[PDB]
């Protein structure tokens, strides 16, 4: 009985949201930034090659000092690297070797990893015994871990193939909040720079903006034709970029609630694995299944440069917090530092 | 030369880590990795019992060879998102229940999962060890029910040998890379203690053939 007016109301609500969005599209971003100026040619060199993993690297994360980085491979290893000298600081044996994500804590004291075992393991890096040990095993997801990010030393947000995200209390090992609403596997998270919001991208071609303290979903962004694999906030936290299997990156605005730019080329047909912005947000970097990383002018949707130098799929990217370098990890088991 | 004392000590620690990483890589490369797939209610658990909540790993040693087997059932997530993690396993063990022909039909669903796994892009060079389970129940039900309930274009003797050979051929037909990967087929029971021997023989064959390719002999 009421199910009928319920679907009527949902359909009219979707129409009304689209009408409100159309009302705000007064001029495309491509028209405002057309006369600003080009970035010319971006040309980056491999400065470091980080060697030592023996299988496909799946994930990498910079520390906030912009010198240490953590790398996750399916050899069952987390390696913490000193990128200036290429020294290995720590090699951490993982209990399960199908790791898909890894996170460096912003204080530098902790590291997290997870994957096909459905668990987020927290590793204490600064013990009195001199070795790295598991300090928590956050269990409660019913699908694989695809992404995790520390908010504090005690909080972390995880995305899962069971279509959910969760906030954790690391000390008590409980889920503080659950974020339901996606209908496909959640592949990626990005924390806002003030960490009061985060954005997730699921295997339903949608992205969602979540309130961390309230647990409610504020905004839903559509437009991709296929699964969103990667997501990254813009430096000021008012926009974010997505990367999909449909061979496209898209830029979304939070306060206009719309897509503002598409980054695509006829000779790019493969899906995108990772995305990140340069320090000013001028450049968007994207890793691909065709073994490259393209550099985009984020304001003019131009290909500004390529980072070529991997022999398998570029699986993960990272720009340092000071903007000095980009790391690329690959399925060929190498990390490369560019500049 | 131009390093400080603590710099040289950090370099020495990094090289000891490198040594340990090479030893663990050499130890991992001598192991056999098996991905264990199967349909709903197909005889995987009995196979796991013979060989011995995300991914479930099983370790066993047999005749000087070490085995790792990964049961990825209960992983209720889109396979296309994690199935590339197993590109590089030695072989795939696929369990099918022979009694499912007369129960979409369970046999057709099993054929479709097999066809999907066999011709996946990540498994072009990956041999398959196909375990046909519950052959006892199959020989009981095949006397009371013809195989035509799932293969209406079948014609042949309603005996266990004929129908089972026909079904093994129906499964081997789904391989569309017959000159790239092999399919190893063994009929098993809940009591067959020769299943680990069959797995070991097939895996030795896979190893010999991977090494033929990798020695250039192709």
């Amino acid at each position: 009985s009421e199910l009928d007016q319920l679907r009527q109301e949902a359909e009219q609500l979707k129409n009304q949201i689209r009408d409100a969005r159309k009302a705000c599209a007064d001029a495309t971003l491509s028209q405002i930034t057309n006369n600003i100026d080009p970035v010319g040619r971006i040309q980056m060199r491999t400065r470091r090659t980080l060697r030592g993993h023996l299988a496909k690297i799946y994930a990498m994360h910079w520390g906030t000092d912009s010198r240490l980085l953590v790398s996750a491979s399916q050899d069952g290893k987390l390696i913490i690297w000193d990128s200036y000298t290429t020294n290995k600081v720590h090699a951490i044996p993982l209990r399960s070797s199908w790791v898909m994500t890894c996170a460096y804590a912003p204080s530098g004291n902790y590291v997290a990893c997870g994957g096909l075992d459905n668990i987020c393991s927290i590793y204490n890096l600064k013990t009195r015994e001199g070795n790295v040990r598991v300090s928590r095993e956050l269990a409660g997801h019913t699908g694989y871990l695809s992404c995790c990010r520390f908010l504090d030393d005690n909080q972390i947000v995880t995305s899962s193939g069971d279509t959910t995200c969760a906030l954790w209390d690391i000390e008590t090992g409980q889920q503080t909040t659950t974020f339901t609403g996606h209908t496909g596997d959640v592949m990626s998270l990005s924390l806002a720079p003030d960490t009061r919001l985060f954005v997730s991208g699921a295997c339903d071609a949608s992205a969602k903006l979540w309130d961390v303290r309230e647990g409610m979903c504020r905004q839903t962004f559509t437009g991709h034709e296929s699964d969103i694999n990667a997501i990254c906030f813009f430096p000021n936290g008012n926009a974010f970029a997505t990367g999909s299997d449909d061979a496209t990156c898209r830029l979304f605005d939070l306060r206009a609630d719309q897509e503002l730019m598409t980054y695509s080329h006829d000779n790019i047909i493969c899906g995108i694995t990772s995305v990140s912005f340069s320090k000013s947000g001028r450049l968007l970097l994207a890793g691909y299944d065709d073994f490259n990383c393209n550099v985009w002018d984020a304001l003019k949707a131009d290909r500004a440069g390529v980072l070529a130098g991997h022999d398998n799929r570029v699986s993960c990217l990272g720009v340092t917090d000071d903007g000095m370098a980009v790391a690329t990890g690959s399925w060929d088991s190498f990390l490369k530092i560019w500049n | 030369c131009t390093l400080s004392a603590e710099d040289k000590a950090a370099v020495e620690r990094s090289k000891m880590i490198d040594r340990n990483l090479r030893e663990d890589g050499e130890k991992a490369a001598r192991e056999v990795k098996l991905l264990l797939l199967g349909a709903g209610e197909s005889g995987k658990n009995t196979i796991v019992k013979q060989m011995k909540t995300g991914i479930v790993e099983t370790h066993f040693t047999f005749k000087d060879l070490h085995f790792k087997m990964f049961d990825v059932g209960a992983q209720r997530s889109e396979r296309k998102k994690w199935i590339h993690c197993f590109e590089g396993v030695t072989a795939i063990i696929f369990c099918v229940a022979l009694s499912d022909y007369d129960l979409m039909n369970r046999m057709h669903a099993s054929m479709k999962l097999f066809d999907s796994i066999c011709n996946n892009k990540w498994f072009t060079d990956t041999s398959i060890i196909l375990f046909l389970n519950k052959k006892d129940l199959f020989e009981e039900k095949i006397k009371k029910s013809p195989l035509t309930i799932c293969y209406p274009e079948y014609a042949g003797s309603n005996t266990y040998e004929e129908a089972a050979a026909y079904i093994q051929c129906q499964f081997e037909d789904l391989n569309k890379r017959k000159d790239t990967k092999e399919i190893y087929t063994h009929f098993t029971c809940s009591t067959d203690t020769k299943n680990v021997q069959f797995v070991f023989d097939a895996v030795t064959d896979v190893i010999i053939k991977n090494n033929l390719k990798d020695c250039g002999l192709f």
């Epitope: 015994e129 | 131009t2 603590e6 950090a10």
Partner: single-chain antibody, 231 residues
């Protein structure tokens, strides 16, 4: 974390002795180990270093050829085999653990010690030996180096240790400015490269002892003569 030395006692000059350090409570084989010794009324003197993994060994010039440092990792034991013992080897011998990687804190745990009674170095200068203090007040301890401790990599390899009257030394500051784990914020260190300062904000009664500056730029590690705080 515990380090227990044994094997000391009264010996005759020219004899031999083996000191042993038993570790418990930490990954012994990940830490490089040092022997540091202290004569009855004198300051700290570095003796020997064995690397983690035994691939690097250093000796002070005064013990080279006579002392051999060795390590038993499965047994968590450090050894110092001394031969041709002289009367200048009368000291309490300490066992110090030390781990080296980016951001690590070397020289952070010292054993209780073992007493042995026998019948182009960088000079660290602590011009003052003794300083009278009242609790609740601030104090500055100065150290100067024969050679610049600032390295081209940006680190200044100066360490501050405190030895309370009856105890083994404690690491206060490593790399000239970093506060060691467990040490109150009242301690701060600053300096130039050849001149250094340890500042105490408000004294307390547990802050009376001898303070030693150590350089960790080149081997052999060299200590200051120590500044003593008297309440």
């Amino acid at each position: 974390v515990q380090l227990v030395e044994s094997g000391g006692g009264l010996v005759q000059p020219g004899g031999s002795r083996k000191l042993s350090c038993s570790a418990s409570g930490f990954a012994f084989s990940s830490f490089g180990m040092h022997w540091v010794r202290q004569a009855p009324e004198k300051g700290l003197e570095w003796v020997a270093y064995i690397s983690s993994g035994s691939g690097t060994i250093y000796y002070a010039d005064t013990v080279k050829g006579r002392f051999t440092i060795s390590r038993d990792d499965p047994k968590n034991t450090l050894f110092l085999q001394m031969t041709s013992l002289r009367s200048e080897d009368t000291a309490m011998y300490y066992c110090v653990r030390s781990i080296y990687y980016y951001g690590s804190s070397p020289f952070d745990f010292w054993g209780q010690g073992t007493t042995l009674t026998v019948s182009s170095d960088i000079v660290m200068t602590q011009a003052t030996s003794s300083v009278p203090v009242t609790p609740g007040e601030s104090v500055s301890i100065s150290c100067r180096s024969s050679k610049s401790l600032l390295h081209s990599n940006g680190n200044t390899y100066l360490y501050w240790f405190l030895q309370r009257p009856g105890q083994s030394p404690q690491l206060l500051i490593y790399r000239m400015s970093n506060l060691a784990s467990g040490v109150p914020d009242r301690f701060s260190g600053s300096g130039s490269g050849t001149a250094f300062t340890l500042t105490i904000s408000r004294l307390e009664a547990e802050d009376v002892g001898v303070y030693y500056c150590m350089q960790h730029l080149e081997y052999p590690l060299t200590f200051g003569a120590g500044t003593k705080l008297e309440l």
